[PDB]
Design a binder for this molecule. Sequence first.
Ligand SMILES: [Cl-]
Lengths: 208, 208
Amino acid sequence: MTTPRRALIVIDVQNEYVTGDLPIEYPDVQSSLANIARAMDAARAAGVPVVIVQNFAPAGSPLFARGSNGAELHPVVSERARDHYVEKSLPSAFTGTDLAGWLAARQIDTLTVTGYMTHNCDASTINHAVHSGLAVEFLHDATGSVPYENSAGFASAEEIHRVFSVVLQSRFAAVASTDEWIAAVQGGTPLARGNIYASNQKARARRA
Amino acid sequence: TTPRRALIVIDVQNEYVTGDLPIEYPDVQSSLANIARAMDAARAAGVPVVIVQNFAPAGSPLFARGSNGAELHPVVSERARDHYVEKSLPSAFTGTDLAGWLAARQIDTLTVTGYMTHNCDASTINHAVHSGLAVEFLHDATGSVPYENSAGFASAEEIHRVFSVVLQSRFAAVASTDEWIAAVQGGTPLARGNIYASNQKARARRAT
Ligand SMILES: [Cl-]
């Protein structure tokens, strides 16, 4: 087997999600911030390129407003080194940006996703990556969601994050812990991916 | 102003009904019936109808080329259509002419029906939004299956609800088939939610 050639992308780790008005609720945000930092430190030690993504909305916007505290990168990011930076104003870190080219220029075959939110920025970015031919990894303990209620119904942060983690594992990404990822980097091994048939069979077999 | 819609009917194949990937929520007869209604309402209004069929290789457990499971369900195979694409990844854009065909017909709004909510439908919607299309998702003309894998468990109800709520928060106007039919007959758009509102309504359940 070929050794995975990973890039770690740290998506929208900004104060809005922590001290601001879109507070991450599951996993616990302090626990995911700590794992983001471990993943970044491990990546730097192992020579895995680290890409920071920052999301902006216009000045005066209620969230992620240019010039506001909430739009600034959290100290976990800002006090660390990085190898690349991408600003975005859409969920996906690829659309219209230099990300795909930058990755390709570094022979990246595997994009390891951390940051926020699981169901929006992270999932959009992963969807683009998968359909471009990249393998994707998702660190379930270095990511997270918020609860939502709207005309379509209610879903908690735990339900959103779990659903997305399980769906990702079924088809789109290797879902793993930060500890698991760090070890796989050390060993030069891929992380395990699930599949739709196994995933649905297991749930059905249990219901039986 | 009046949307220029196309209705896309994704992967309404026997695998999901009589085969080995049975849709569990919403009830599959109820969503098949609504897909039928939506197609007929589109037809009557001159809204174009696009059919998508997903194939895996001959001999695969699901969607195998040559198998009954891979065939379109008669609800859809016996009806009129304006366009057809076959695909082999979740998004109906990747490796198909879909974006080109929609562009040639000056489509600005894509209405999504068919299966699965969290896989083919979500991936198609995420591509469409990022290409600049407006998207609608008919929550009673779509559906999910349960999954269990190394990332955890989630039921079909949880998966469909979580994706319906997340889509309403940012990616699509989520509506019932009746609401869509009324919007087509009236030449009006459907309502979209937003992330900040969705999160604020959920946070109010704490009742501090
Ligand atoms: Cl698995």
